[PDB]
A paper describes a structure:
From yeast to mammals, the [name] and [name]-like (mixed-lineage leukemia) multi-subunit protein complexes, known as [name] or [name] [name], are responsible for [name] methylation. [name] is an important subunit of [name]/[name] complexes, where it plays an essential role in both catalyzing [name] trimethylation and maintaining the state of trimethylated [name]. Although the structures of the human [name] C-terminal domain (Dpy30C) and SPRY domain of Ash2L containing the DBM motif were solved, the binding mode and stoichiometry of [name] and Ash2L within [name] remain uncertain, partly because the complex structure is lacking.
We also solved the [name] full-length (Dpy30FL) structure at a resolution of 2.13 Å. It contains two Dyp30 molecules in an asymmetric unit. Although we used the Dpy30FL sample for crystallization, only the C-terminal 55 residues (amino acids 45–99) were well defined in the structure. We can only model a fragment of poly-alanine here without visible side chains based on the electron density map. We deduced that this fragment could be the [name] N-terminal domain because no other peptide was mixed with the protein during purification and crystallization. However, it is noteworthy that the binding site is exactly the same as that observed for the Dpy30C dimer (CD) interacting with the Bre2DBM peptide. The molecular packing pattern of the Dpy30FL crystal indicates that [name] oligomerizes with weak stability.
Numbering used by the authors:
A (entry chain A), C (entry chain A): 45 to 102
B (entry chain B), D (entry chain B): 24 to 35, 44 to 102
The structure:
Amino acid sequence: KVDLQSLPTRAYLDQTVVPILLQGLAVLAKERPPNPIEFLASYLLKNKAQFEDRNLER
Amino acid sequence: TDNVERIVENEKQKVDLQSLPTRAYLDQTVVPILLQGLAVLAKERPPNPIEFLASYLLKNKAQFEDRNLER
Amino acid sequence: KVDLQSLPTRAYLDQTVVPILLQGLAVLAKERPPNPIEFLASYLLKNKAQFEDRNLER
Amino acid sequence: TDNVERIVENEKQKVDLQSLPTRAYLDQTVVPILLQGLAVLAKERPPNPIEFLASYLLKNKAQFEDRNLER
């Protein structure tokens, strides 16, 4: 009975944050804003709804 | 084999964050705090991982921001 | 707790020497001096102060 | 895919270091010793990396200098 808690580290990350990070990092590299960490963190929060629970968690 | 990375590509004067190649730009700005946050996230495995990672960035931004090519 | 010593190879180099090298290599390619290795090494030493510790080391 | 590089650009007679295209010039002069030095630097991770790399160049210049289109 595998779930998010039991997955290997890389699989866990690939299931949860890797897709939104890939998108966000690509946007960040294009924009190059004055506050990149804040920008990325903001990006995650703004776009969370489109990426959240699209994984084993269902 | 790994420490071989063509930067002769990007060079083909004054270098700042805006002019850095993509990988260098990211490595200068977010990769350190991301590496730390992703490690914390993988260990905790919280119910809201995207939110948690974003919170981690915000909470630890002060220790990582401006520690790069633009002081 | 990440620091310079713990960074992946490329991130380490990007944090420490890549920016000054980019600038120096561009100057070297423009000047084409009789002693290019010496010129580049000299460039690094002369401009070190403007690039040194502008990274995680702080 | 990678071994495809237009030099028909640069050709459009006697070739020396001064007339080489930028990438070729760098590859002829500093890329070898830089590749070696960057590898040594990444493995050691010293307190003064720019200084260390410059020192590496100076110390090993004799094994790399003039091993190119101009003997």
